[PDB]
Amino acid sequence: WKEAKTTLFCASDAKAYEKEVHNVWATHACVPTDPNPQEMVLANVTENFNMWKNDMVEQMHEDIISLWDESLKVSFDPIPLHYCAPAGFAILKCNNKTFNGTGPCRNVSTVQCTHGIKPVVSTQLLLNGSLAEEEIIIRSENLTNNAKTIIVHLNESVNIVCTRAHCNINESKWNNTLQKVGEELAKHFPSKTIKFEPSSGGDLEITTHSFNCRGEFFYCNTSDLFNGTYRNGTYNHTGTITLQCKIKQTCNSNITGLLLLRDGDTETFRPGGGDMRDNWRSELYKYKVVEI
């Protein structure tokens, strides 16, 4: 029961016959998930976590790269993946649903494998991921460091349908989200107007909302979405909302989180992304690895 590093393995609901690329790679590189798991539980116990220095993230990343690599050289839709600890090791599961992802957690558990986590590669918005119980959750290695990305966990999901391209969000549900977000942000930022602006520059995946459906790459315009200023009170202005998406050569998913970046009297944030290690950090903030 001492924190260490070791080579994890993955389990999948993979089906041999399914030619779906994930199932093809999964079956080969993965083993059946254990049906009857299997949690121990602790309380009054406190452990130091750190979603920002977590070897588990690196392992998942390497597998997904290799996943896409083998894949590309048609069926495509990600599967919930599980990551398990070798005999001699276990995985601490922090149960404090208020955890900022860094520091001490006074309420932890013990499992061998992680929950089903779909490897969905995207930018600006995390999709099909898990939700935050209760309040909006806010995470960053260093807020004082505007250069470090900010991960915002959603406690209520928003549906999305990009198809052809164009995508759609419910205005009513979006503005609801952002006010509560500027609120949480206002908690971390005092006498400062919290503005939201589209990605200021850089690669096309990073400046638009990017993601892949059925094997097609969708790069969608985000200018309308990140166009709101929120002082004490709050109000988002933009042209339901529609975002123009480009294609390459229909899918309905749930938005569950955000990636923000602050600019160095006001504090404006923009959408980030790129390093998919955050998409992972988004789902592996709760896990940690110890040898017994």
């Epitope: 790269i65 690669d203 995946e205 390459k248």
Partner: nanobody
């Protein structure tokens, strides 16, 4: 992920030339960018060159266009940096670096935000 190790750094008279080599111990997928950044003393980390791993498109920092040249060898999992007509300003630690861009729209390499790094190699230019 991929393991980066730069070499060939050194000390050279102004106007001189020098070649740096980065080698990835892991393996680079098709959707990768490989580039060079450098940090001069007292200053911050800037960009120098980038090459698409698959298509081999390049991009150079303006202060570099014409003098440096970035090349790859997929067989050896290696990227190289030929630096000619060196100036005292080119003095810095050079870092090989990489970036997994599976959602890249084009073969054009990036000039920003890399995710995987090397430990750096020393480059010093004497006036």
């Amino acid at each position: 992920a991929v393991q980066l190790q730069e070499s060939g750094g050194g000390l050279v008279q102004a106007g001189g030339s020098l070649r740096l080599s980065c080698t990835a111990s892991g393996r680079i997928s098709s959707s990768y960018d490989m580039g060079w950044f450098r940090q001069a003393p007292g200053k911050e980390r800037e960009f120098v060159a980038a090459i698409s791993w698959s298509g081999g498109t390049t991009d150079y920092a303006d202060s570099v266009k014409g003098r440096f040249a970035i090349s790859k060898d997929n067989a050896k999992n290696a990227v190289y940096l030929q630096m000619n007509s060196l100036k005292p300003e080119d003095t810095a630690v050079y870092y090989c670096a990489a970036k997994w861009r599976p959602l890249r729209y084009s073969d054009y390499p990036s000039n920003s935000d890399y995710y995987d790094w090397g430990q750096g190699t020393q480059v010093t230019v004497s006036s």
